[PDB]
């Protein structure tokens, strides 16, 4: 649990007497990356890269990046090797439930079982069944964000109470009332209505919002409630990025299998060569493409909902 605080350390310290925000991101960030990737083959070559990095570690002498002039971390390099271990087993398990990696190997024979294609292991999720299941998966993605938003508001209320800073606590209470009201109302109106049950709780949430606002009468931040709605809605990208990556990998394996079939008896060699070359280059691009999104999300939403950009310790 310890090493991730070094990653946190790249930004400023917080004011003393406040909450220590480190331990959440050890369990959350590799979770998010695993949700993204599912590319266990990249994890394999990545593990080889980690073997090379540990080769430097026993070669304790710190390298300098030629292009970027950056002296190595080696202690912090080992901290990396640990967090790389965390993200790699997360990658492994999410790719396991996404059992096709490199793409969908079951073209020529039953590598995996599907309701359509017979195979060895009946797999759970494909990229074709997501014609139906994407809605449910996106709902899960939304719930994922609302969980961390609730954690952030709870912590902010707790610190507002501890500091005897009751104004911010009251503003948080208003945030809760408005959030639950608009969330439940949108869920009812967009989805199934069922007005006989939930209309009262929507009205109560709105009443809580307005009561907190009126006790906090002084020209407050209804636009910031709108922005925090933007914040909770912003985390949807987690599904889309991984879906695009899986679609691309499936396209690459379709290309490889078609080259294996339509190009005669000798098409397998060239198909696998081209597929490997394209796969490695697209991964070279998309790994650095994908890596920074969840840390960006954690940064902006968590530390804006939390709010710490004051006095910098």
């Amino acid at each position: 649990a310890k090493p991730f605080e070094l990653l946190v350390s790249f930004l400023n310290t917080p004011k003393y007497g406040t909450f220590d925000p480190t331990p959440v991101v050890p369990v959350f960030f590799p979770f998010w990356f695993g949700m993204i990737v599912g590319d266990i083959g990249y994890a394999l070559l990545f593990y080889l890269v980690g073997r090379w990095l540990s080769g430097y570690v026993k070669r304790n002498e710190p390298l300098v990046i030629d292009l970027f002039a950056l002296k190595l971390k080696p202690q912090v390099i080992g901290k990396l090797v640990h967090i790389l271990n965390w993200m790699v087993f997360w990658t492994v398990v999410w790719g396991v439930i996404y059992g096709e990696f490199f793409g969908t190997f079951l073209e020529h024979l039953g590598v995996f079982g599907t309701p359509e294609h017979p195979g060895l292991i009946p797999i759970l999720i494909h990229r074709i069944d997501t014609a139906k299941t994407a809605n449910l998966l996106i709902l899960l993605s939304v719930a994922f964000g609302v969980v961390l938003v609730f954690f952030g508001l709870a912590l902010r209320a707790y610190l507002g109470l501890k500091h005897r800073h009751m104004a911010h606590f009251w503003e948080g209470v208003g945030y809760l009332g408005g959030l639950v009201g608009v969330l439940a109302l949108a869920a009812s109106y967009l989805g199934n209505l069922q007005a006989g049950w939930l209309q009262g709780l929507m009205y109560l949430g709105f009443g809580v919002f307005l009561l907190a606002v009126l006790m906090s009468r002084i020209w407050l931040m209804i636009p910031e409630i709108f922005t925090q709605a933007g914040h909770i809605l912003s985390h949807i990208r987690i599904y889309a990025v991984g879906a695009a990556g899986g679609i691309l990998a499936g396209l690459l394996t379709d290309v490889g299998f078609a080259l294996a079939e339509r190009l005669g008896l000798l098409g397998v060699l060239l198909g696998l060569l081209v597929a490997g070359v394209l796969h490695l280059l697209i991964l070279l691009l998309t790994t650095l493409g994908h890596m920074l999104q969840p840390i960006r999300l954690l940064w902006v939403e968590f530390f804006t909902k939390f709010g710490f950009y004051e006095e910098n310790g």
């Binding site: 967009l190 989805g191 922005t227 709605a229 933007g230 809605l233 912003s234 804006t304 950009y309």
Partner: protein, 73 residues
């Protein structure tokens, strides 16, 4: 067999594309200015950065309209 579904698709496509165009137009200038400000200061960091995050609500609006018109289906 109604033909309105493709109309729904093209309408939401226009909405989201126009929203993306406008927000990117914002992001270009404000990001360049933020690069200048942080490169000279580094203490205007978050203050410049939040301005980059401002126009995303314009995106999520048209996303919401697209979603409700999809849910009409």
């Amino acid at each position: 067999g109604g033909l309105d579904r493709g109309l729904i698709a093209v309408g939401m496509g226009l909405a989201v594309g126009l929203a993306a165009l406008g927000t990117g137009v914002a992001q270009a200038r404000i990001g360049a200015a933020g690069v200048g400000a942080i490169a000279e200061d580094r203490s205007n960091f978050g203050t410049a950065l939040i301005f980059l995050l401002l126009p995303e609500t314009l995106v999520i609006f048209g996303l919401l309209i697209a979603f409700i018109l999809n849910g009409r289906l």
